[PDB]
Symmetry: D3
């Protein structure tokens, strides 16, 4: 599919998965993270750098034909860390791409951009943001920045609002939010194969009977997820306590993130 694909956040949980699963997409896979990476094998390059370091990010991106941007802060943390990984880091990534041929980007956004919506409300891609903490706010920043680079320079980005990308659903909320490895992989393949992408919002979930999100406007991309969290409903009842109706886990799309305070260093 391409000569060189960059995967950032490659030492993280999703990154380790994609390091294996996206190998067939490119002759060379370049893996990057702030954290130490397992050594490069055949057809791999490994890079260590902070997203907040502009010169390092420039070098990280140079020579890459595509980027799967998983690197950054995924859970609620103090502002200082979010600022570095998700705000400054995003600016540096977009500037680096702009300097090196505008390789297409798959951005790991988050359901936390809309975490304060009730689970009873079905959402299209144009709904106003309701971020459930600083992490969500920073993912909104990434989306707004990507949109600006698209309108201004034509840089294309898939804004993937990831639900819960896990080996299997493991609580009641994931019956709605589960995004299987297979379905995220197929989405990434669909994003890179498209002649024209634009800067679309993509709801990152499998084809769950209990899904909250409407991807119908993305029809042009031809991506239909195949897995379905509903198959795990009994598994969940037989492995977890029944949710309290007052629990954020079943009240808000962001789940317990709404209960987070502003964390401090």
């Amino acid at each position: 599919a391409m000569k060189r694909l960059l995967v950032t956040g490659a030492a993280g949980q999703l990154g380790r998965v994609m390091r294996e699963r996206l190998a067939p997409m490119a002759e060379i896979l370049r893996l990057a993270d702030l954290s130490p990476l397992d050594p490069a094998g055949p057809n791999e390059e490994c890079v260590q750098c902070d997203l907040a370091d502009a010169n390092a990010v420039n070098a990280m991106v140079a020579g890459c034909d595509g980027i799967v941007h998983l690197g950054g802060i995924s859970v609620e943390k103090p502002f200082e860390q979010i600022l570095q990984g998700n705000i400054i880091g995003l600016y540096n990534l977009y500037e680096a791409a702009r300097a090196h041929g505008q390789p297409r980007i798959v951005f790991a956004s988050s359901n936390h951009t809309i975490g304060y919506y009730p689970q009873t409300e079905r959402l299209g891609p144009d709904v106003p943001a309701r971020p459930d903490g600083l992490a969500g706010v920073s993912k909104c920043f990434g989306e707004n920045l990507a949109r600006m680079y698209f309108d201004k320079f034509g840089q294309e980005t898939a804004l993937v609002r990831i639900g819960s990308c896990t080996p299997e659903p493991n609580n009641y909320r994931m019956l709605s939010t589960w995004f299987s490895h297979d379905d995220f992989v197929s989405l990434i393949e669909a994003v890179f194969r498209a002649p024209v992408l634009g800067c679309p919002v993509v709801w990152g979930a499998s084809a769950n009977d209990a899904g909250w999100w409407d991807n119908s406007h993305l029809g042009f991309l031809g991506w239909k997820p195949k897995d379905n969290a509903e198959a795990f409903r009994r598994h969940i009842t037989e492995t977890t306590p029944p949710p309290d109706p007052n629990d954020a886990l079943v009240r808000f799309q962001g789940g317990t993130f709404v209960d987070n305070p502003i964390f401090k260093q």
Copy 2:
């Protein structure tokens, strides 16, 4: 279903398909075209006439219980040819129907009525027209005329905006626009069986993963296409050159029609 079914445009590529496939729908199939028709076999009648000749169209329609109107200009041509076949011709068809019991009509409209929309935009049946040439404008004329006859006289018409009704998808655009022979035939069967039809806009496409159009409002008809162009994606990448992202073929719903000039005779 009925004693006699009229198929216009019967010499054309699509009409030749329907001459074969719609036979079971009527005791007699009347085939008509401006061009020479293969001679009538059993249970057939053949009539060669110009849609622009009112007296001929009156006789063509007389004694028919339904009409599949494929006849006319469906590619970009100079104004005079389109005026005769698609504007004068449509007036003549509707007047003929009005004089002979208002047989129900399946009208071959076209995606070219909306050809200037970007391929990234999903369309419902009520979107404003954006025709991509004179052919598209003339198909809009047919839709507007049909609506008027419906409101004024009760004449019922299915306004079928045909995508690409071909044996198989064979380019990137057809992954979205493909309308299988089987699915068009089943649509026609559903149109004629309905006790009440009205004058609905119908998107002429199969159940393609990459489809751009929303047929949900047509639910009352009970027609669900079964074919899916997505099955051909791999085959298409294996047997055709990758599209240029700048090509109208992958930018506009009307494809290369947007690039057509106004043709002169």
Copy 3:
């Protein structure tokens, strides 16, 4: 699912089905009706009373963890009868629930709340009511009352606008309105399992190709009907007279109810 489930209208056509099919949902099924009930078997309790009598309704509800409310008038009748079963009866039911722990309610509303809409119009859950008679108006009363108790007290109710819940479709309208026993049972299961329900409008139909109604906004519940009336189209055409296009049966969503007069005592 629960210790004790109440099924009202248990002597009726649908009640007799649910008395059998809902047994696995609770340790004890309590059946109630105005009319005589077949004697209680193991795991059953049976009570005979009028919904219009508050003391009786209090006793009927006391000790129940959930209610499937089928009891009442579902065909057009004189106002006097409707007032007792569907208006006074509903007030009594909601007051009894409020006094006894607010057991979740599945309310048998009706398509007759929207019976005057044309069959050609697809409806979402928020459409304004267009009741086709006093029965329809009275089911609207139930919906409005339920919504008030939800907003004021937190009482949760599924407002199920039942189409045609029969063993099989047997006329043209039922190709659209059929609601299979299996699909109603699975809906009831999905309603009671949900940690959070609210007070949603639910369109009571199976997954019919010719369905008129949009349940997409109920996605959070994870209920997907599995039956399809379309399978019966051939049989219906074979075994029944073609509808006249002027017949209410094929013109209004409420079918022949629009033709009902106001019946008098």
Copy 4:
């Protein structure tokens, strides 16, 4: 305008206003109420009857060319009183109208049909009901019944959702809900003069800067209210205590009605 106009609820605060202001609209004004009416002057008839008494309502309506229906319960009361005045009473009114030439009806509905909406939400005429008590639910009943008589028999009704029809705004909520006497009178004049009315929902409010409701779809009637509660804002801050932000008065469109319990006799 007409020979005889019926005004029900004529003993009430609003009815007393209309007894005076609507006199010019008819040769004879018939006033009716359950409560004692000031004796009839010239060009008046007075009738004292209960809306729940069908025979009385028949005689009340007989010989009338139009009806302004103000009679009934418009504050929260126990169920039985509301049942008699607003449910049985509405049935009786519509049946009486049906038996006597279908005189056009102005129905006093209420903002309480939508009382649970937040004051920050702007509402169009098609929003789903959110009644704030039994009074609101019963006013919804009137709206649903009127719609049914319209669709079934052609009876025309203006469904006027009255905000606060008082001499002057005197609290923060009335800056939004105020409906001047002048503007209600002009609305009634516009309703009766219209060749074609239908069964429209009308928001009963003056042209208030802080209004919550959108009457644009009623444009065809040519009624434009002229009064504006905003003129009273300064006066209100000068003569009343500032509202507590936690008070229902400034949180819900139904104001303090949301705080009402279910009243018992």
Copy 5:
């Protein structure tokens, strides 16, 4: 505003008004009509020709900086006449403009493009067409053709759906459809002054209290009509017969045009 402005249909009722009122907009006014024109005065040119004749239309347009296109058939007539003036004539006009610098066009479309909508329905600019006869269908053709030339060549046109442009309202329908001379003149001024126009639908009515149409989306143009037909209501009631509620005049937006047959030569 410009050196030379063309006004077609200049011999007609509206043309004679604009010949006078638009004189200040250009150094030279060129007046054109099929029929004889009063002789050119200072600052005028007059040309007599049929829009169906391409050579003549080329000469008519050459050297003009803008066009107010009033010429054509605006009442119901046989298809032959409409074809010449409104279909062939429109094609000729757009081709002439394309060959001569694409002077901006104000097109006299018509309310008859939407004549079958009920008067009770408020319309925005995107509603599907519901033409009330061949004249209406032909004005739709003009709109669709204009839109194609805009998308394909950048030709800008204001599609003005004229209501009733008369010296004063003189029947009930005109209380809604009246478009004063002053307000049409100011619209034309706003159209020509705009740096960017596009191809907008414009509802051609004054600021009537009983208006049916929504021009809010045209806000960017900065045009606000100032006249109001409501001022004439009393006069109209005094001096004309009350409409029968069954009259097309008070039921359909196109008024009596819905009652027109298809006229024959």
Copy 6:
């Protein structure tokens, strides 16, 4: 209206205006800026601090009952400066407010959050952001952060998307975007007087005939701007060159900001 009102950015152009105009709103006006301020007069406190300095911001906010936040970067600048004033600065302001009683905030957002929309498109408050540079993106950050603090802590903020707040309109774009001093002052008064505000988007423009923005959903606030840029149209024609139709000034809502590159330090 309050004991102490904070105005940030008080040395800037809008700040100097508000220092005078908002004086009557509070017993004490506290003015702050990174830049030196003219010395405090009677009833004034003057503070010098960087918004990026958390401790200083805490002290700035402490003791204030309301905040008009004008401080920050208003034009396109390099990322480093934007990061400090609009990103870090916003976090510090919200944290400081949260620590000191959550004084209500008027936030100076910007039209640049939606700068890439065409001027021909009318925008409601819920449209997706289309920021026209880093400044717009950073104003989006402020909006998203404010929304999160509202949902999480109940902090109330008016998100005022300022158009062009100048003494008078001085170019063609300002005929649409002008926000008079008087109208901004009255908006601020309305925001502080409201019992309940929430976190609404407010379009910051006067009542311009050529306005692009719809504030109708803010109706509850009772704020209606009184000035109208249209009065200056002739003034603009007689003081500036006519805009080129290709100029960003008349093509994009953000005007020439779309033409800005990413500026560097």
